Design a binder for this molecule. Sequence first.
Ligand SMILES: Nc1nnc(-c2ccc(C(=O)O)cc2)s1
Length: 329
Amino acid sequence: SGPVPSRARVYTDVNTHRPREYWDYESHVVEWGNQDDYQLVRKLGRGKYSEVFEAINITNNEKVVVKILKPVKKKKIKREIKILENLRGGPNIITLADIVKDPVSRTPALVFEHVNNTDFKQLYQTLTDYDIRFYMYEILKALDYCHSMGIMHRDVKPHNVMIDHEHRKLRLIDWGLAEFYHPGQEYNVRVASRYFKGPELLVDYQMYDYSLDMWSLGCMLASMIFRKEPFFHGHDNYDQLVRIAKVLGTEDLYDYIDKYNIELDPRFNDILGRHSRKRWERFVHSENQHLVSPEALDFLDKLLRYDHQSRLTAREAMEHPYFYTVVKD
Ligand SMILES: Nc1nnc(-c2ccc(C(=O)O)cc2)s1
């Protein structure tokens, strides 16, 4: 008595009908640029997987970002490179400008375009209703494109969305966890940041798809219109799903479990408890009302759903009324 298999309802076989070389990244033969064309300048980020630096291309005085890949299996590096290459030129997709064998760990190093980024903890406090609609629309173009190209980002979150506010410029970065969708494949549920993780990942349902990114996006939309970052703030993976059940309610949650016949950890039993589904208006107050609207609540409602097969796709989302001031302009 195991889980019921699932399939993306859209773009289900895009990779199945593309030449093997498109998704068989392990056979990809990298063509290298010259590492002497770049001068690192300042370190910006240090995470468990990379060292990111603001840098300068000395053949044109253009700023760029260099991500040196700490040693970590040639498969992971090839996956990201192949994906970045497949998506290059996509709408709002960060541009991979060069790839070089970096002597700083003989490791490779990816050279990305620079985005004069206003940091997410300070910007969100200053955005307007129209600004959020606009940027949500831009993020959607990137996801529908990447999904339409058989690729799940799997790490959608505010750090992974660069915004050069003064130029109304948006870029979706860090495709390090991104993967190719092949119908019926069981993936690694340990992706995405805790606060943006979808129900499927939290109950250990592996045959997920593109709709994972839609949940992450819904969590971002919620944080922005209500001005609460992160919106579902759990202590750990178990508590995270509890944070979601307190808002969406346990009823629907158990209806999801039943439909896919997912055996829940017996430790989830006592801590999920029993909660009623709350109204989005309960989170509306005087510091966030000007960013909230029926369209918004309705659009958010259609993103944050337990069943991944019921969430709106990126294309459907762009058709939402929430975006006409935007799509009209
Ligand atoms: N200021 C910045 N401009 N681009 C940045 C950037 C782009 C991509 C990645 C990645 O890991 O893919 C990391 C940082 S950071």
